[PDB]
Amino acid sequence: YCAAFKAYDFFDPYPAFAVDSNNSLVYSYTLNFNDIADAVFENFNSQGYGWGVVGGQRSTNITYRDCNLNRVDMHNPYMGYLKVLDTRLGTWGINASGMGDMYLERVTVDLDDSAHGGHREHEGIINARGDFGGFHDGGLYIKDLTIVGEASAFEATSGHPVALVSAYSFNASLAYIPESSPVTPWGFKEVIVEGLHCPFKRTGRRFNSIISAPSIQFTVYHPMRVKLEDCNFNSTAFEKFDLRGWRVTPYNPSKVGIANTLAFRPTNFVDVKDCSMVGLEFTRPTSAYDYSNFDVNLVNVKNVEEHSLSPFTLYTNQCGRYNLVGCGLQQIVDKSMTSGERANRRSTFSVTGGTWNSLSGNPTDITYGNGYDIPVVATGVMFVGPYSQTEVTGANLNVAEFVQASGCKFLSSGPTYIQPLLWSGAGGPTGASANFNVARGNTLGLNISAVNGETSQVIAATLVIPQGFSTGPAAGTTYGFAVEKNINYQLGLNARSLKANVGLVRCSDTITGVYLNA
Amino acid sequence: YCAAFKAYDFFDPYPAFAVDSNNSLVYSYTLNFNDIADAVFENFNSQGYGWGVVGGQRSTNITYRDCNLNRVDMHNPYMGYLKVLDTRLGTWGINASGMGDMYLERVTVDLDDSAHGGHREHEGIINARGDFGGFHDGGLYIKDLTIVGEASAFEATSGHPVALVSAYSFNASLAYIPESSPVTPWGFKEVIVEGLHCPFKRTGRRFNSIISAPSIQFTVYHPMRVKLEDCNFNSTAFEKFDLRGWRVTPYNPSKVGIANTLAFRPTNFVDVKDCSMVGLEFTRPTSAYDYSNFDVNLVNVKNVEEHSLSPFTLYTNQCGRYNLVGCGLQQIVDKSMTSGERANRRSTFSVTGGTWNSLSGNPTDITYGNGYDIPVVATGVMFVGPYSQTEVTGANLNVAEFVQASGCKFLSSGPTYIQPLLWSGAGGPTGASANFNVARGNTLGLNISAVNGETSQVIAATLVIPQGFSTGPAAGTTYGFAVEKNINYQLGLNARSLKANVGLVRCSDTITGVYLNA
């Protein structure tokens, strides 16, 4: 019952290490307060091994400035704001349920936990209270966060590193939010991270998950909006968004099954700008909880560190819409590597600008419904990979079937640019057998060798695949001087929903090759 | 005449509430200073109803930190800088004319004004002094501003909520900047807002305007550059940029009439990124003050709250260039809802990526000059709305006439995609009548039923509308095997500036339908 005060340079050489008969850690606090308001703590010094040194309950407008503590904690939720500025934090991080907003600025976290064997009560760095239901009805705003250490002792027992943000309940029959309560059970309403620095390289992935709910109690919602900006993870493995332990979103209370991402409203939003990772993964929830529709925006995302190659790959398993602008893309895979599932809904992908360097593989790996009804669209993209103009390679067929391109360039190795080859043979007047799929809307070029009585000429024709308004084939005519005749060509088409299957190549003269005229 | 000092820990349980014989508020101060420099005020407590408790004149390099005051004010302009950090403010906000820069960081504003009978000296939250001409020759930089309350008394007595930033003069004959003065009469030279939080939902719109000049004195220029980022208005009505009441911009001193927004230089710049609002509106000034040319950039703008649907609408009747990248667009309306005026000049629109979900209406509403000379250009956009492939609907004709699209998809309700239908009939050799407009540069596909002496075939042909270099019609030639003849078709065109009117459908065989091949 204190208000309008300020504390100053208390000095503790090291915190207490209290155990029980079984040599397991028990609670002990250097500072413990209940029912305070308008408090400022400055230059507090209690850092080291042991239990968290701060315990708070039912407080308002708490500020920590220039402190050196191993934990900032709050059992009963706070209200108003909670500010941690210019503070160095220990392995426990921050554990606080709240009905307000949390602010972090210029905070360093040290994750070493060697003295403790396992004993990690909350699996993330910034956590809600697992004994209060795991709710935080407010936003979290982070600026210039620095991470050092690894927390190897926890990883040995659990098998994975710590998460960045965690919000879950230990037991839904003891800690939960009742239906009649006016509290909205948000894990965190919003998460904004602007500036994450990791000066030391990590072999593997930096975090187990960005937002984690590793329980099976299903008490709180996944955050409505997550934004990452200027975050350098400095790791050699892809980061992932795990969505497998969250309550059903309040945007779909009736639990309507979504068939296409464009036929339902979005329920969650993710933005990543100017951040550096090797890859990003989205894992959908299990059945009876899979009713979300995500909206993802990626801008200028690639790997800048020298040890792990530049291009990044996008793994996805959750229904949603994906937009990429000026990114260093490597591959698009419609599966989650963590679980192995292969997607069960129709998504949307759009790529604008940047470079699509697939290295030694195909640009896309999409197999849900054989890839039909998946509109991958690219505009003004430079494609680098195992493409060829004289041989029909796997990359040539993959990019022609799955990607609708416009104003794009292709370059395998040489200083110049090439046109991918799709088919080679002799398309005479009786037809020739072909078998390959092309996305409707792509432009194809055909090299024609026209021969008259005693004269011949090389013809370069251009053909556009119809969008699918009709069941007719793709055909056209052109003229050639020095032979004084018309050249007629036609490609047979079989319906493949968004794509088309070429089954027969036919021309009045001989067609020698079909090229991707992107 | 004080300098190089600091003041700490002054507690005032509540500010003075001074009135006059007519029970109206009069001035009263807790702190008052003239001619100071290098001053720091920390932990000042004076909060509640009454007149603003701070009044300053002619100062340099003033700093407020960790304060709890109902107003921060400067009557005569300051120079150097003015900083408000980690401070809680009352309903008055900040009122300061300046000859320097203003900085705000982590400031909470409470808008409740019940005790006052609806009287506000200024109509915004951050204001320039109206008794000094309403000028501020310098920038305004805001970071993590939080708004609580509603200011219901002022809204009840005026009809609209308070504005965000305000700069105007009460009387131009008493407070103004003379021509011979070296002061440049900027309202605010630059406005940068990064982070706006509104934890409580508002029924209506949060602010009357972003930058407001609600007088008819015309003493200061509109801000040259305005930037918004990570702003969540949490309201159910659109926000608007009101451009009435501003002095003519110095970029057009001779007041040259602009006609196309591309033949004159830009005069004002607006950027909005990752903001959440229902809509956005631009209202042009009245005649004798409409000489501005705006440059607007919108990146990733949509509504994320659960109560108001995701897609956002753009209202504008002001001459300028508009760019949208990855936005959740609903409709583009070339009129102002506030005033009802439509337009008088030619603008430019460019849409890249994102989703264009028009719900149950048309994607565009453009009227000025019947839509001609307005180049709306889209690239890689997914269109959702009342489209149909078996029937001709208004959305089909609207999107065909007003939007020039390339690499775009259409989905009405189903799990698959459709091609909008523009015309149905029987286009024989004589020619069937038709009447519909299509923007030049779009690709049109037509379903043709070809019949030979005994054989028949379905033909799918594509056509590109010429850009307008000539007065000839759009024609083409294709070939069909199994009928052994060429198929010729032609669409009669009537020139409408950037568009073309199709008046006749002609083909040697029968044309049964015309589709938008995008």
Side-chain angles (χ1 to χ4, degrees):
Chain A
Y1 287 124
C2 301
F5 65 91
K6 32 207 226 173
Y8 277 122
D9 352 276
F10 191 88
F11 202 95
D12 195 11
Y14 47 82
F17 200 103
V19 290
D20 50 20
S21 61
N22 284 319
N23 222 56
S24 54
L25 273 176
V26 292
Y27 79 99
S28 44
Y29 308 120
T30 313
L31 177 77
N32 181 67
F33 54 85
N34 307 62
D35 287 296
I36 71 169
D38 297 2
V40 182
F41 297 100
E42 283 211 38
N43 203 20
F44 256 59
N45 264 269
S46 201
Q47 185 68 259
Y49 289 129
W51 199 268
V53 303
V54 174
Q57 268 159 350
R58 292 212 305 201
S59 302
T60 309
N61 294 344
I62 317 298
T63 305
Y64 294 90
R65 187 182 276 116
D66 280 294
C67 291
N68 197 21
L69 312 158
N70 75 337
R71 183 178 94 160
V72 166
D73 179 78
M74 197 86 22
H75 290 54
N76 273 85
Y78 72 95
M79 80 168 252
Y81 58 71
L82 172 64
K83 290 170 181 171
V84 187
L85 317 159
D86 280 296
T87 302
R88 281 163 279 153
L89 288 184
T91 192
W92 300 110
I94 296 184
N95 303 335
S97 59
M99 323 164 188
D101 296 329
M102 194 170 333
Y103 293 89
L104 274 78
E105 169 158 83
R106 274 174 250 118
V107 174
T108 306
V109 181
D110 194 17
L111 289 170
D112 287 332
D113 58 351
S114 147
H116 324 144
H119 203 303
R120 181 104 198 172
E121 46 169 4
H122 301 85
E123 291 198 14
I125 297 180
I126 297 113
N127 308 285
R129 285 310 297 231
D131 38 320
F132 286 76
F135 76 96
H136 186 286
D137 202 353
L140 165 73
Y141 311 102
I142 302 170
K143 260 165 215 240
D144 282 325
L145 183 67
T146 305
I147 313 284
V148 289
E150 285 219 1
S152 47
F154 167 71
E155 180 161 357
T157 303
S158 83
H160 47 69
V162 291
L164 179 60
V165 185
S166 190
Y168 63 106
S169 173
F170 295 148
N171 191 347
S173 69
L174 294 184
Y176 62 101
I177 299 102
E179 220 65 41
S180 59
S181 172
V183 176
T184 315
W186 287 111
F188 277 85
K189 191 162 164 62
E190 283 184 1
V191 177
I192 318 290
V193 189
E194 161 170 6
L196 185 94
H197 323 118
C198 306
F200 298 107
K201 205 249 278 195
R202 166 64 201 259
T203 302
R205 70 185 85 246
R206 182 67 61 178
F207 302 115
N208 186 46
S209 176
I210 284 169
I211 325 286
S212 196
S215 84
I216 54 151
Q217 308 301 321
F218 304 96
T219 49
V220 284
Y221 307 134
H222 183 278
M224 173 189 54
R225 177 165 173 256
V226 178
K227 185 181 180 206
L228 309 172
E229 186 172 79
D230 284 336
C231 299
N232 190 359
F233 292 90
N234 200 2
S235 54
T236 66
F238 61 90
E239 316 295 329
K240 56 183 203 270
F241 277 83
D242 201 341
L243 321 156
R244 255 180 315 181
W246 304 99
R247 200 156 141 174
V248 166
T249 166
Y251 289 58
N252 194 3
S254 168
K255 310 229 278 282
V256 173
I258 301 147
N260 196 302
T261 181
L262 299 180
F264 202 79
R265 73 187 298 192
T267 68
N268 295 82
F269 306 86
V270 176
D271 322 80
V272 179
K273 319 198 138 185
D274 279 290
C275 290
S276 174
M277 56 230 67
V278 163
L280 192 50
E281 192 210 58
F282 294 79
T283 306
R284 81 170 175 265
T286 82
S287 89
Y289 295 102
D290 176 37
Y291 294 99
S292 291
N293 194 14
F294 267 67
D295 194 23
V296 188
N297 256 283
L298 311 170
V299 174
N300 194 38
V301 175
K302 64 205 78 179
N303 171 60
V304 302
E305 303 278 0
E306 174 271 353
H307 50 65
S308 285
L309 273 163
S310 192
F312 87 105
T313 146
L314 168 68
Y315 313 89
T316 203
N317 201 31
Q318 155 87 39
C319 179
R321 316 147 192 191
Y322 302 85
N323 272 284
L324 293 92
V325 177
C327 289
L329 194 53
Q330 169 171 353
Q331 198 170 46
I332 293 189
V333 192
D334 69 345
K335 83 187 304 260
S336 160
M337 311 282 338
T338 315
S339 55
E341 316 278 47
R342 259 289 182 188
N344 52 347
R345 276 89 142 83
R346 296 155 179 96
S347 307
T348 278
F349 301 91
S350 171
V351 185
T352 307
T355 312
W356 199 329
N357 192 345
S358 82
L359 296 175
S360 49
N362 306 330
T364 56
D365 187 12
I366 297 179
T367 45
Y368 167 62
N370 297 289
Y372 327 139
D373 309 293
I374 311 291
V376 184
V377 172
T379 295
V381 181
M382 317 285 147
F383 287 91
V384 200
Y387 303 102
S388 183
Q389 191 161 336
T390 44
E391 302 318 13
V392 182
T393 74
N396 294 344
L397 296 169
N398 186 262
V399 74
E401 172 175 1
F402 287 96
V403 180
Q404 179 190 342
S406 99
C408 295
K409 300 294 174 188
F410 295 89
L411 178 136
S412 50
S413 66
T416 51
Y417 301 85
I418 56 145
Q419 268 70 60
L421 172 76
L422 308 175
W423 183 88
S424 178
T430 36
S433 150
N435 201 33
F436 60 99
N437 294 344
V438 290
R440 306 193 172 242
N442 275 340
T443 299
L444 301 193
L446 15 143
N447 175 86
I448 299 175
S449 176
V451 152
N452 212 56
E454 48 291 301
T455 40
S456 71
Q457 171 180 203
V458 168
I459 311 270
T462 278
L463 191 62
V464 168
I465 307 293
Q467 262 313 313
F469 52 88
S470 163
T471 68
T477 106
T478 182
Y479 192 81
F481 293 86
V483 285
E484 278 69 79
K485 80 194 294 217
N486 269 316
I487 326 289
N488 310 289
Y489 43 89
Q490 166 174 310
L491 299 186
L493 296 188
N494 298 306
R496 287 304 187 273
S497 182
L498 228 47
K499 328 286 199 288
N501 174 261
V502 179
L504 196 79
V505 178
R506 172 132 60 153
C507 173
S508 51
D509 294 277
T510 306
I511 285 181
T512 45
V514 180
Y515 301 82
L516 184 61
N517 192 347
Chain B
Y1 287 120
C2 307
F5 65 94
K6 34 176 76 167
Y8 290 110
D9 299 337
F10 190 90
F11 203 95
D12 185 20
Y14 46 84
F17 199 101
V19 294
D20 54 21
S21 325
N22 315 59
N23 227 35
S24 58
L25 252 74
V26 297
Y27 85 95
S28 161
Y29 301 128
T30 308
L31 179 72
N32 185 234
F33 54 83
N34 324 61
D35 287 289
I36 67 169
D38 302 11
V40 178
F41 301 97
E42 287 206 43
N43 197 30
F44 262 54
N45 267 270
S46 195
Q47 186 71 261
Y49 292 128
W51 196 272
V53 299
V54 184
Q57 321 240 24
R58 272 216 300 198
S59 302
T60 309
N61 297 344
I62 317 301
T63 311
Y64 298 88
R65 194 185 271 113
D66 288 322
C67 285
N68 191 21
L69 312 157
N70 71 342
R71 183 182 93 163
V72 162
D73 170 280
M74 290 270 330
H75 283 28
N76 279 259
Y78 70 97
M79 68 157 39
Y81 59 73
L82 168 71
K83 298 174 178 174
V84 191
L85 326 161
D86 290 299
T87 297
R88 285 165 282 154
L89 291 179
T91 187
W92 302 112
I94 301 173
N95 304 340
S97 50
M99 289 147 45
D101 296 321
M102 221 186 267
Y103 299 89
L104 275 75
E105 217 206 11
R106 270 177 259 113
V107 169
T108 306
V109 180
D110 195 341
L111 283 176
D112 299 310
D113 65 337
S114 198
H116 322 139
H119 148 270
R120 289 270 298 208
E121 226 188 353
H122 299 86
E123 289 202 21
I125 297 177
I126 302 111
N127 318 280
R129 286 310 297 225
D131 44 320
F132 279 81
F135 69 94
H136 187 286
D137 201 348
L140 165 65
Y141 315 101
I142 304 172
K143 209 149 315 193
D144 280 313
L145 180 69
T146 303
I147 307 286
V148 298
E150 292 226 321
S152 42
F154 170 74
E155 163 149 29
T157 207
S158 88
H160 49 75
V162 301
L164 181 58
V165 181
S166 192
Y168 62 106
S169 176
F170 299 152
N171 192 337
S173 73
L174 294 179
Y176 66 102
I177 316 288
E179 302 284 5
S180 61
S181 173
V183 172
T184 312
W186 290 110
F188 274 89
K189 174 73 174 288
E190 241 177 34
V191 177
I192 318 293
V193 183
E194 172 151 5
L196 197 87
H197 322 300
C198 304
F200 296 104
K201 185 190 117 188
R202 206 269 195 281
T203 303
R205 77 189 87 248
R206 183 69 62 178
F207 305 118
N208 184 48
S209 187
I210 308 282
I211 319 281
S212 170
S215 83
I216 45 168
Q217 311 296 320
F218 306 90
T219 40
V220 285
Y221 308 132
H222 186 275
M224 171 209 44
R225 182 174 181 255
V226 180
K227 183 181 185 208
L228 302 172
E229 185 176 5
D230 291 306
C231 297
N232 190 5
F233 293 93
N234 202 358
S235 49
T236 74
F238 60 86
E239 311 295 323
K240 41 179 198 267
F241 268 92
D242 204 344
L243 312 175
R244 293 181 291 201
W246 301 103
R247 195 169 159 169
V248 168
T249 167
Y251 293 56
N252 192 1
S254 291
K255 287 160 59 153
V256 170
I258 305 166
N260 199 97
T261 220
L262 293 178
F264 203 78
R265 72 186 302 188
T267 73
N268 297 85
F269 306 84
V270 170
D271 305 78
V272 179
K273 295 142 136 83
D274 297 285
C275 293
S276 171
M277 48 193 105
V278 159
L280 194 51
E281 179 180 64
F282 296 81
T283 310
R284 72 163 181 262
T286 70
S287 292
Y289 297 102
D290 174 34
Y291 296 101
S292 301
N293 209 3
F294 267 70
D295 200 326
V296 185
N297 263 261
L298 309 175
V299 178
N300 192 43
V301 171
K302 67 206 72 172
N303 170 56
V304 302
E305 294 291 329
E306 198 262 336
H307 51 69
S308 290
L309 285 172
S310 182
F312 101 99
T313 311
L314 173 64
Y315 305 95
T316 174
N317 64 344
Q318 221 272 323
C319 197
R321 320 146 186 195
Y322 301 86
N323 268 292
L324 295 93
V325 181
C327 291
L329 194 59
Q330 172 172 350
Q331 198 173 43
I332 293 185
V333 190
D334 83 352
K335 90 181 288 204
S336 180
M337 292 276 105
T338 296
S339 75
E341 310 208 69
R342 262 279 171 202
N344 59 337
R345 330 257 194 201
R346 305 171 177 75
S347 269
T348 290
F349 300 92
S350 170
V351 183
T352 306
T355 308
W356 197 331
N357 181 15
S358 78
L359 300 176
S360 58
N362 298 332
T364 67
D365 194 9
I366 296 177
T367 278
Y368 165 65
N370 286 301
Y372 327 141
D373 300 327
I374 311 292
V376 187
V377 168
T379 314
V381 184
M382 315 265 123
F383 283 92
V384 188
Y387 302 102
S388 183
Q389 193 164 339
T390 49
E391 200 44 62
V392 179
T393 68
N396 303 331
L397 302 165
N398 191 261
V399 81
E401 172 173 359
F402 286 99
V403 178
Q404 178 192 345
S406 66
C408 294
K409 300 293 179 186
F410 297 90
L411 184 133
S412 71
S413 72
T416 39
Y417 300 83
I418 55 180
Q419 277 73 43
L421 173 73
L422 309 176
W423 183 85
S424 289
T430 36
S433 91
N435 189 30
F436 59 100
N437 292 340
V438 48
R440 309 196 170 243
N442 272 339
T443 301
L444 258 45
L446 11 93
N447 176 92
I448 301 186
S449 181
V451 153
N452 208 64
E454 207 61 33
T455 326
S456 68
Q457 196 196 7
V458 179
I459 307 279
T462 34
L463 188 55
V464 187
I465 313 295
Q467 258 300 335
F469 52 87
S470 167
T471 81
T477 295
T478 186
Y479 193 75
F481 295 85
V483 280
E484 278 81 300
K485 61 190 274 200
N486 290 248
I487 297 100
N488 311 290
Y489 44 89
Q490 155 173 334
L491 265 57
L493 296 188
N494 300 308
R496 317 247 183 279
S497 183
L498 272 171
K499 323 283 199 277
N501 175 262
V502 176
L504 201 76
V505 174
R506 207 193 262 250
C507 177
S508 44
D509 290 282
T510 300
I511 289 183
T512 53
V514 175
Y515 302 84
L516 181 65
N517 186 318

